[PDB]
Ligand binder design. Structure first.
Ligand SMILES: CC(C)CNC(=O)[C@H](CC(C)C)NP(=O)(O)CNC(=O)OCc1ccccc1
Ligand SMILES: [Ca+2]
Ligand SMILES: [Ca+2]
Ligand SMILES: [Ca+2]
Ligand SMILES: [Ca+2]
Ligand SMILES: [Zn+2]
Length: 316
């Protein structure tokens, strides 16, 4: 909408106060004009018609319980935009400052979040498996990263390419979480998963097997559930990424860690310069090795560590 840029204040899903960029024209809208061609947050009103209505508020204060998922979707989209711009020189998901749109309060008791091809969509959860999913910065960045993938590598959402697609979203979700630097970890969705159970998460990158996800290619799922296991086999790539960054010895194979920033550079380059819609795990290894070679040189520690990590998870 046409209006003047304003700054509202509110509370997110976890009860934390934050400022949000809004737009004033009769109402205050969740429209952040400070980033690209805008970040827009919508109310789906417990229904499934999208996007719903651009979020309107009378007083620019967002402290109601109903407001909380909108505050966080809007704010964490901003953080994710900042990460891609500041760290990778990428302007929004398309590289040309496309408007970023999110809808919250999608459906009823909805235990998921997704990119629908055009926008991000967040359920409120059922209060048992999830609380509103935009409360997780890693979740928001995971979703926006699906848009980045779709505009770049275009990894088909099934089997090995789909598991890479998922892992890319978990990797950058985690790197954005570290970028914001509030309780960062290598777990996925811990802030919004199972409010009645402390210390767990939806997935773990550091130890995928803690939730039954494979951490070695020999343990990959090859059935048809979950688009051929895209949220399961992602553990194999998540583990490799974790090892590249943090190091470790895994099934007897030692990996020298090179840190998060270099992991991000290597995987961003692989995603945008080498991966294709049909890339499999072996092709991802090759893409990561080539990316590290481009950035750091063939004889570098970074290249050696990429090879070690993929060796450790059984991907040749
Ligand atoms: C068991 C589920 C919770 C799995 N979902 C996830 O792991 C994450 C959310 C977590 C990061 C919290 N959501 P996601 O991977 O974006 C869900 N994916 C998904 O719905 O894809 C299917 C799809 C939807 C719309 C258009 C094309 C294809
Ligand atoms: Ca208000
Ligand atoms: Ca965390
Ligand atoms: Ca996390
Ligand atoms: Ca929990
Ligand atoms: Zn995903």
């Amino acid at each position: 909408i046409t209006g003047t840029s304003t700054v509202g204040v509110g509370r997110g899903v976890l009860g934390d106060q934050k400022n949000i960029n809004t737009t004033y024209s009769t109402y205050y809208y969740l429209q952040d004009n400070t980033r690209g061609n805008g970040i827009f947050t919508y109310d789906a009103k417990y229904r499934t018609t999208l996007p719903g209505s651009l979020w309107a508020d009378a007083d620019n204060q967002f402290f109601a319980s109903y407001d909380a998922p909108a505050v966080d979707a809007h704010y964490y989209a901003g953080v994710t935009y900042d990460y891609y711009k500041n760290v990778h020189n990428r302007l929004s998901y398309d590289g040309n400052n496309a408007a970023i749109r999110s809808s919250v309060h999608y459906s009823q008791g909805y235990n998921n979040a997704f990119w629908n091809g055009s926008q991000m969509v967040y359920g409120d959860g059922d209060g048992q498996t999830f609380i509103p999913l935009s409360g997780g910065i890693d979740v928001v960045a995971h979703e926006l990263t699906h848009a980045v993938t779709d505009y770049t590598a275009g990894l088909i959402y099934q089997n090995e390419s789909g598991a890479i697609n998922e892992a890319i979203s978990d990797i950058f979700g985690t790197l954005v979480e570290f970028y914001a630097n509030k309780n960062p970890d290598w777990e996925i969705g811990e802030d919004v998963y199972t409010p009645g159970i402390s210390g767990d998460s939806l997935r773990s990158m550091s130890d995928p097997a803690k939730y039954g996800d494979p951490d070695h290619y020999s343990k990959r799922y090859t059935g048809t559930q979950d688009n051929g296991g895209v949220h399961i086999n992602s553990g194999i790539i998540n583990k490799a990424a974790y090892l590249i960054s943090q190091g470790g010895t895994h099934y007897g194979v030692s990996v020298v860690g090179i840190g998060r920033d270099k992991l991000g550079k290597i995987f961003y380059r692989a995603l945008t310069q080498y991966l294709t819609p049909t890339s499999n795990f072996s092709q991802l290894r090759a893409a990561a090795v080539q990316s590290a070679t481009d950035l750091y040189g063939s004889t570098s520690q970074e290249v050696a560590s990429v090879k070690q990590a993929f060796d450790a998870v059984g991907v040749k």
